[PDB]
């Protein structure tokens, strides 16, 4: 939910693509979380060692 007045600002001042930056942080966030999930089902589901 990025503003339509943002992209024009951010295309002009920073040259960055606005949209393609959010699609950058959403696509990365889900694949970071889905990846933080399985590592957290390994450490959740792992027996206690040295016992």
């Amino acid at each position: 939910a990025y503003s339509i007045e943002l992209t024009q600002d951010l295309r002009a001042v920073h040259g960055m693509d606005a949209d393609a930056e959010l699609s950058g942080i959403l696509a990365t966030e889900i694949m970071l979380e889905i990846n933080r999930e399985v590592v957290d089902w390994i450490n959740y589901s792992a027996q206690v060692g040295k016992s």
């Binding site: 339509i4 992209t7 024009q8 600002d9 951010l10 295309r11 002009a12 001042v13």
Partner: protein
Amino acid sequence: TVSKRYKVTGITDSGFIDLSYASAPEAGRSLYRMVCEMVSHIQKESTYTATFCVASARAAAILAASGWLKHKPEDDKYLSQNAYGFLANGLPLYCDTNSPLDYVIVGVVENIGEKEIVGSIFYAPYTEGLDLDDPEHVGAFKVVVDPESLQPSIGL
């Protein structure tokens, strides 16, 4: 809401002149003195030559009632078709027909070229950074199609 109010002690005191139909263009030219004086009160304080004039319809007619506002067929070229005519002083007189005053503004627009552009109310639209079809449109439309009734909504 910008232009410095022009007040002379004799007549224009209270902030503006009062013109009555009595006797002749003597009322209509008595405004053309105030336009001429406002143009020389730009050249003192601003120092720029005051290249236009703006007046509400009713107050640009009594400045046309003075005579000395000559549109005429051959003179079309220099007034860019928007002007109501040229004051004999050499200024284009842009009829307003909108604002709620009956005012007469004098102002300046001068671009010496390159990066120096000076004149009242700089405007200066911003599209740069946006993808437009043709440069001159100053902002782009957008279409939506409400997802309740599917009929579109267009906005700029």
